[PDB]
């Protein structure tokens, strides 16, 4: 039973950054040489665990997280950084025995008229603990005039939608990001 990482990375569509999903890779063998030799990958900065011995090492379990974010904000997923995409939408701890993978995806995720399906949270009263998810969409308030649920002055919708269009693509091009974290999985099993 080969691990389904090659079937989850090589997929059709993913969820937004604020509604990121997780998958539990069960007991299976996993060869990451296919991850290393893949030319389509763009950013593969792997923190913590040594890169080459990644297949050699064995851990209790591995978790796979993924989402879609702007190209210019792929840097902020790295540990020990702050911003509008890492402080609120998806926070990552100071040190984690895993690493992230990012590769460009424009044709499969952007349309000439623009895409409205992807959303990202803009307003929140406080930051998030590491590996914390929040889906609830409550009308965020300035705090002086209570909002009963009517949009207007001092009451805004917390969620906002990215706009992806064929453009310069330096930072506005949509980038797909997948996060692997290590906690019964061994690769070689010689």
């Amino acid at each position, epitope marked *: 039973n080969l691990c389904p990482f090659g079937e989850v990375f090589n997929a059709t569509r993913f969820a937004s950054v604020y509604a990121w999903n997780r998958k539990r890779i069960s007991n299976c063998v996993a060869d990451y040489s296919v991850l290393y030799n893949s030319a389509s990958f763009s950013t593969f900065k792997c923190y913590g665990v040594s890169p080459t011995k990644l297949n050699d090492l064995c851990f209790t379990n591995v978790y796979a997280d993924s989402f879609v974010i702007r190209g210019d904000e792929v840097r902020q997923i790295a540990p020990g950084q702050t911003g509008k995409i890492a402080d609120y939408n998806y926070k990552l701890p100071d040190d984690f025995t895993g690493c992230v993978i990012a590769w460009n995806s424009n044709n499969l995720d952007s349309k000439v008229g*623009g895409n409205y399906n992807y959303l990202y949270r803009l*307003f929140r009263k406080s930051n998030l603990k590491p590996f914390e998810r929040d889906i609830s969409t409550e009308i965020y308030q300035a705090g002086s005039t209570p909002c009963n649920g009517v949009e207007g002055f001092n009451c805004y919708f917390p969620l906002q939608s990215y706009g992806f269009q064929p453009t310069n693509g330096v930072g506005y091009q949509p980038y797909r990001v997948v996060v692997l974290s290590f906690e019964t999985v061994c690769g070689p099993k010689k």
Partner: single-chain antibody
Amino acid sequence: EVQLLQSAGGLVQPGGSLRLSCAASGFTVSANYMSWVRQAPGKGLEWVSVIYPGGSTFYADSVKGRFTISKDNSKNTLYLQMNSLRVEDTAVYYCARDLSVAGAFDIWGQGTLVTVSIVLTQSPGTLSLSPGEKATLFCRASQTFSSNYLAWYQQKPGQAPSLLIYGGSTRAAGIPDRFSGSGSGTDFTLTINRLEPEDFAIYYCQEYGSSPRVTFGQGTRL
């Protein structure tokens, strides 16, 4: 009615220190954003700082470490700590509330004067006209964006700027129908159907595409 107040005027020798304050009524400082924009004499507006809810903060690389920004929920004010100065820091400081995409810098302060001891450009320049004729403005961007990150500002002499257009032709409440905007691709245009006697002012373009950075154009006068 939301209104800001500032008390920072003074004269300081190089190497001195002076602090700034901004009282806010009608909106909590902790929840809403904050931003200090600096305008050198005879120069365009320049960005200094931004405060998101929580301890996150970012500065302008031009002035890093010499400026410290902090908030205070007790007095509903934010301070701009300033331990080190130089000769080129002489300017006027404006503090305003930010809303990112859903509006940009809706309400501004009154401006305080202090004295010591991607790029955007706007073409037309003077564009002098009598009240009868119609006026159109042009400012372009070196790198294209989805046009949802643009804003237009007007600044009457001796006062503080106010919002006119945000988010790609979406006007503000109370703004007359005279002002309108339309921009696509690299060239972005604002048109004014009729010129009232009071409409004579100075207009600026804005871009908030970058998350921590906002770049202000040189601006056009009328």
